[PDB]
Design a protein around this ligand. Structure first.
Ligand code: CL
Lengths: 257, 244
């Protein structure tokens, strides 16, 4: 019955064991450089389905973990394609879309049936994808995430005061503690943090409003990936968080005909 | 009568000779090295007023050019302060505000009397400054500019030109390079629009969006907020300081 689902990204592997397209028996997560998951306890899976955007070392690690537990287990390295699980890929070259993004589109299509979606994923980059209710993925936008913008300004811009990666964390925590209002600032470090917050929220809000106007129907803004607490609090438009779009999509792929 | 005004920024040095109020007899620019302005022709100035955010080598170059033409000319290095020329500095530490930003706020206040302003400058960073109708500079927002955002994502001139030709309210892209370019552009436009609406809400009154210097056609085109361009706020501000 059960399928092992692996969602490997920059530093973290998230995983689930699924007995259907939508149901997880259990799940967890671990850092790929250091950790080993507790899989000694799991029922043996029929196969594994893997989304890996973390590179070849992570691929070798995933294989090592799989084969240490279930030698020679069948596995499928998931990739974007032209059409799958109700989604049609609008990319000019479908296979150039990231596997995590493809699995996530499939999960969203299933999780929110009958709905036009704008999917915002918060990672190193902030990614926005437009998904029609009929399953057409019509395209994307990518912008730097808040920390990446803050690195540009605080560490890579000579003419601005130094704001370290760790100092940016402080400013982000303070934004959240202030419910992410981000007023015009009266000191330069706060001008950086508030301007970067305003860019993130402004991006998402603009894209959502324009998509409703373009498609002439309601659009659900779906938040995926990192918590992005300050960004989420700043938004003035309605939104729905879903934390397992990629794993859900992998379950669907695994249990498809 | 006439005052020499110097606006030394990161990219080059701009200058003007101003006689009456904000009017310029002439103006020009020069690179930080090797260029010499043709100041042999100018009428002798009473003094020079200098905004320099470019550092000490630029300061030395400026002094060298001044003293080569008008030895020992009186000069004043402009710095942000608590209040000057109708503007009040809302920075917690007024002197931490850049002198260029200060002069520009003063020039803006004079150019648009009685108006609330959002002043946007498109440089390596995108800088937004809020200036209330009573002259209070109430703060700033800074984000990376388009090119810097692109660089951070691993990336461009062709892409930027291509964006001007496209519908900025139907921006979703079908390949990764265009998704990056459009995403960065949407972030710039979204930033400006959100900040503007926030000021109109905070102040319960109309706000003029002023573009200080140039902006990519694509960014300007993407905006749904009307704007006014003004290319000489700093030098205009320096003229007002000089005469005060
Ligand atoms: Cl685990």
């Amino acid at each position: 019955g059960v399928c092992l689902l692996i969602d490997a990204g920059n530093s973290r592997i998230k995983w689930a064991l699924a007995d259907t397209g939508r149901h997880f028996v259990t799940s967890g997560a671990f850092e790929h450089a250091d950790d080993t998951p507790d899989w000694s306890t799991l029922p043996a899976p029929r196969g594994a389905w893997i989304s890996n955007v973390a590179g070849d070392a992570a691929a070798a690690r995933i294989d090592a973990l799989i084969d240490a537990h279930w030698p020679a287990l069948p596995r499928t390295v998931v990739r974007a394609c032209a059409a799958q699980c109700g989604v049609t890929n609008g990319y000019a070259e479908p296979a150039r879309l990231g596997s995590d993004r493809w699995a996530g589109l499939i999960g969203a299509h299933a999780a929110f049936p009958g709905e036009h979606l704008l999917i915002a994923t918060f990672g190193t980059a902030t990614t926005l994808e437009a998904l029609r209710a009929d399953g057409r993925f019509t395209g994307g936008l990518i912008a730097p995430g808040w920390a990446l913008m803050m690195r540009s300004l605080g560490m890579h811009t000579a003419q601005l005061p130094t704001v370290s990666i760790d100092a940016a964390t402080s400013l982000l925590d303070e934004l959240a503690a202030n419910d992410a209002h981000a007023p015009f600032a009266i000191d330069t470090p706060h001008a950086l943090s508030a301007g970067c917050l305003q860019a993130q929220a402004g991006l998402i809000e603009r894209a959502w409003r324009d998509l409703e106007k373009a498609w002439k129907a309601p659009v659900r803004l779906v938040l995926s990936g990192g918590a992005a607490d300050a960004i989420v609090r700043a938004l003035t438009v309605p939104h729905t968080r879903h934390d397992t779009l990629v794993l859900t999509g992998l379950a669907l792929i695994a249990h498809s005909a």
